[PDB]
């Protein structure tokens, strides 16, 4: 079998994507971030508190005749920028674009951060992590990818990310059709859980390329390009006026500023993410400041290849028996 599905950016930032996906019969389709650095799948729900729903799309189980509780399980979850929820869980049917998986742990949410709820558009998240991760008690559950991988024609999905535009999730099969040259393919370690993989350097505009190792995560569920502050200060330097600044949080430029690519290395390939990827826009409304989308990963504990990164690429999650990552440009 394969699936495939188009994810939409949320906002005129690609703050993140949207993937809709059916679950239950009759199907209630729900727009979920897919996050292939986490390994839940959890959903606003009607067992969600009333005060914490704000304009999101619900999952309601009991009107889904192929919904069951699963005893006794329940889950918490927060993430990396400290937004956070819980609940407990049903089995259901899940379906995306496509491809279905019955008997999928999907997790309704009790509870939502205020960070959840403020954003409408988002109505729960789609773990594409390994299920190590997974946080369902006391019996872990297994992520959608883990549960669809035997009946794949390929056991892969790929991550077709746009820049201000629609993109592509696709289960089971690669599209020859969506990249330009060689998919580049990369060591992963699964130890921490992640699809974590070291890039071989990175230049930055026209500059010459540095060789040296960045160990990472590819996580489509992160908006920035997170990296070493050696690294970070590097880039920031060629443009005139940015700065970090400690009451913003990073790094900021001149919203005039244009920026430099940054390209980054897979093996011996190269994966170049153009200047505009970069601009995150006003730190406020009508500021003359913008937000970089290059950050210090100083005190986060690893890099992260977020989206700014990825959506310069067509990434393959190879999922055999030893994972491994494909980049290629497109």
Same mark, same amino acid.
């Given at each position: 079998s394969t699936g495939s599905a188009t994810t939409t950016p949320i906002d005129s930032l690609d703050d993140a994507?949207?993937?809709?996906?059916?679950?239950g019969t009759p199907a209630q389709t729900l727009n979920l971030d897919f996050d292939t650095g986490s390994s839940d799948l959890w959903v606003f729900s009607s067992e969600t508190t009333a005060s914490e729903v704000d304009g999101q799309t619900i999952y309601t189980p009991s009107k889904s005749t192929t919904a069951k509780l699963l005893?006794?399980?329940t889950w918490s979850?927060?993430?990396?920028?400290?937004?956070?929820?819980?609940?407990?869980?049903?089995? =259901? @049917?899940?379906?995306?674009?496509?491809? @279905?998986?019955?008997?999928?742990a999907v997790e309704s949410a009790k509870k939502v951060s205020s960070s959840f709820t403020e954003d409408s558009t988002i109505d729960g998240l789609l773990g594409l992590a390994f299920s190590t991760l997974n946080t369902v008690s006391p019996t872990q559950?297994?992520?959608? &990818?883990?549960?669809?991988?035997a009946s794949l024609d390929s056991p892969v999905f790929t991550a077709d990310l746009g820049y201000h535009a629609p993109g592509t999730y696709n289960f089971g099969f690669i599209d020859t059709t969506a990249?330009?040259?060689?998919?580049?393919?990369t060591a992963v370690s699964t130890k921490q859980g992640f699809w974590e993989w070291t890039s071989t350097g990175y230049a930055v505009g026209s500059g010459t390329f540095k060789s040296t190792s960045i160990d990472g995560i590819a996580d489509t569920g992160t908006t920035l390009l997170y990296l070493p502050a050696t690294v970070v200060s590097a880039y920031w330097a060629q443009v005139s006026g940015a700065k970090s600044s400690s009451s913003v949080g990073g790094y900021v430029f001149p919203c005039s500023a244009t920026l430099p690519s940054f390209t980054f290395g897979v093996g011996?390939?190269?994966?170049?993410?153009?200047? =505009?990827?970069?601009? &995150?826009?006003?730190?406020?409304?009508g500021s003359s400041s913008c937000f970089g989308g290059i950050q210090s990963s100083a005190g986060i504990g690893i890099n992260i290849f977020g989206d700014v990164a990825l959506k310069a690429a067509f990434v393959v999650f190879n999922g055999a028996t030893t994972p491994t990552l494909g980049f290629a440009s497109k």
């Open positions: 994507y949207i993937t809709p996906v059916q679950i005893s006794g399980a979850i927060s993430y990396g920028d400290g937004s956070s929820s819980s609940g407990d869980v049903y089995t =259901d @049917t899940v379906s995306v674009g496509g491809l @279905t998986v019955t008997g999928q559950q297994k992520t959608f &990818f883990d549960n669809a991988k990249y330009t040259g060689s998919i580049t393919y011996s390939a190269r994966i170049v993410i153009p200047g =505009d990827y970069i601009d &995150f826009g006003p730190i406020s409304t």
